[PDB]
Antibody, heavy 218, light 212 residues
C-alpha cells in the first residue's frame, strides 16, 4: 500500500525551526518527486515546493525559499521539510504529497503534521473519567473521558488500546478563553458488558510528549 | 504570478447537480486537476488532466476546461460529497498553483434527532477543586442547535463554553457544551440541566449532586 507517514505535531517558538519527516513506502521512492503543501487553520492550500528524489534538486515557492530546506534521505525513503525563522503565521498543517510520476498533479497526500508557532507554554491534558452517577434500566450506557486543559492542538483518543472502535465518538475540542483546549470522547456500550470488561481511554498529546491511559469502568 | 479563482461556496441538494468553476487566463491551454478535502481529513485527488477520474471516483463527477474557465460538476450529489474542492495547475513560471477553494454543502437532507448525554463532574476533578459538567450532542441534522444550561430551573449565564457544530464521518453534526462551576456551586443545587433544541424539538438531560 502506498503510504506517506509523517512525524508528530509540535509547538515551536517564533524564531525557531521545525523539521518534519515523511516516510514513504509501498512504491519505489525515486520514481516520484515529493511536494510539501501547508494549510493554515480554516484557510486554503499553499504550495511550498517540490523535490526531485533522485538529485535532491528542488523548486521552491519563492515566498519560502529563503527559509525552507527540502531534502531526502534515499537510504530511508524519507523526505524532510525544515522551515526556519518561524513566524506566528506559519501555524498550519504541513502535508507531504507525492507528485504523479511524469505528471504534475499530487496523487497521494500525507495526513499532515500540525505545527503551532507561539510563545505560549505547552500543556499536557488532565484526563478525567465520565460516568453517570446513577442514571432508568436500559441496555445502553455512555462512558467517557474529559481531556481537559491542553495546548496546542492536536490530541488523539483511542479506547482499550485501539480494540474498541464501535460506538466510539470523539468530539472536536472547545477553545477556552484561558487559551487552553478541552475535548471529550464517549463510548456507547452494551450495559451487560459493564462489569465483565474494563474500559480505558488512551490520550496522546504529541506537542507535550504526554500519554495518559484512564480507567473509566472496571 | 498565475492566479486561479474559484467561487467561495456552492450548495447542492441530495441527488442534484452543481458545478464549481476555476477561472484563469487561458486556463483552457493548461491541464487542470482537482482535490476534495472532507472535513478534518487530508485532500484527495478527484480529477486530473481536466476530465480524468482516478481510482474509486464515480462517473457522476465530471470535469471540463475551455477558454478561461475550467469546471468540476458533481451530479447525483451524496452526503459524502461535502467539503472543500481545490483546482490546481502547473505553470512553467509559477509552478504549482491552487485555487482558493470552494466550500460545497449538500442540502435537502433528512432530519436526524440528536442523542444527548450529560455527565456530572468526576470524583477526580472534584478532588482537584474543579467541577465541569459535560453535555455531548451527537448524530443531528441540520446543524442549527441551541444549548441552554439551568441550575434548579434558573438559566446559567456564566461558565458556559459551547462548541460550534461540526460534521461527523456519518454526515450528521456533533457539538459539546461545558459548564464550569466550583465544587461548592455544584453541591449548592438540587439539579443541573442541559437543554438542547433542534428543529423546534427540545430535549433535556439532568444530573443531581445528591445522586453522586
Amino acid at each position: 500500500q502506498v503510504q506517506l507517514v509523517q512525524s508528530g505535531s509540535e509547538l515551536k517558538k517564533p524564531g525557531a525551526s521545525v523539521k518534519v519527516s515523511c516516510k514513504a513506502s509501498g512504491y519505489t521512492f525515486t520514481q516520484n518527486n515529493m511536494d510539501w503543501v501547508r494549510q493554515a487553520p480554516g484557510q486554503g492550500l499553499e504550495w511550498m515546493g517540490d523535490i526531485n528524489t533522485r538529485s535532491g534538486g528542488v523548486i521552491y515557492n519563492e515566498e519560502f525559499q529563503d527559509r525552507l530546506i527540502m531534502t531526502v534521505d534515499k537510504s530511508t525513503d524519507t523526505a524532510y521539510m525544515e522551515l526556519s525563522s518561524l513566524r506566528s503565521e506559519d501555524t498550519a498543517t504541513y502535508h507531504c504529497a507525492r507528485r504523479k510520476s511524469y505528471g504534475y498533479y499530487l496523487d497521494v497526500w500525507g495526513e499532515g503534521t500540525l505545527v503551532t508557532v507561539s510563545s505560549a507554554s505547552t500543556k499536557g491534558p488532565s484526563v478525567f473519567p465520565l460516568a453517570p452517577c446513577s442514571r432508568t434500566s436500559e441496555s445502553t450506557a455512555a462512558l467517557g473521558c474529559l481531556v481537559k486543559d491542553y495546548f496546542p492542538e492536536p490530541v488523539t483518543v483511542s479506547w482499550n488500546s485501539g480494540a474498541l472502535t464501535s460506538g466510539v465518538h470523539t468530539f472536536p475540542a472547545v477553545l477556552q478563553s484561558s487559551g487552553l483546549y478541552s475535548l471529550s470522547s464517549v463510548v456507547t456500550v452494551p450495559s451487560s458488558s459493564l462489569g465483565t470488561q474494563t474500559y480505558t481511554c488512551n490520550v496522546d498529546h504529541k506537542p507535550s510528549n504526554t500519554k495518559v491511559d484512564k480507567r473509566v469502568e472496571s | 504570478s498565475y492566479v486561479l479563482t474559484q467561487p467561495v461556496s456552492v450548495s447542492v441538494a441530495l441527488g442534484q447537480t452543481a458545478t464549481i468553476t476555476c477561472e484563469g487566463e487561458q486556463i483552457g491551454s493548461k491541464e487542470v486537476h482537482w482535490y476534495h478535502q472532507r472535513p478534518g481529513q487530508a485532500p484527495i485527488l478527484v480529477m486530473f488532466r481536466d476530465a480524468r477520474r482516478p481510482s474509486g471516483i464515480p462517473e457522476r463527477l465530471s470535469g471540463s476546461n475551455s477558454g478561461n474557465t475550467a469546471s468540476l460538476t458533481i451530479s447525483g450529489a451524496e452526503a459524502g460529497d461535502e467539503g472543500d474542492y481545490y483546482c490546481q495547475v502547473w505553470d512553467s513560471s509559477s509552478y504549482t498553483v491552487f485555487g482558493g477553494g470552494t466550500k460545497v454543502t449538500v442540502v435537502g437532507q433528512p432530519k436526524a434527532a440528536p442523542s444527548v448525554t450529560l455527565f456530572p463532574p468526576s470524583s477526580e476533578e472534584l478532588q482537584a477543586n474543579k467541577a465541569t459538567l459535560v453535555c455531548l450532542i451527537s448524530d443531528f441534522y441540520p446543524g442549527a442547535v441551541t444549548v441552554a444550561w439551568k441550575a434548579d430551573s434558573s438559566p446559567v449565564k456564566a461558565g458556559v463554553e459551547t462548541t460550534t457544530p461540526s460534521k461527523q464521518s456519518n454526515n450528521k453534526y456533533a457539538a459539546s457544551s461545558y459548564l464550569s462551576l466550583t465544587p461548592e456551586q455544584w453541591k449548592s443545587h438540587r439539579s443541573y440541566s442541559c437543554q438542547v433544541t433542534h428543529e423546534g424539538s427540545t430535549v433535556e438531560k439532568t444530573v443531581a449532586p445528591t445522586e453522586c
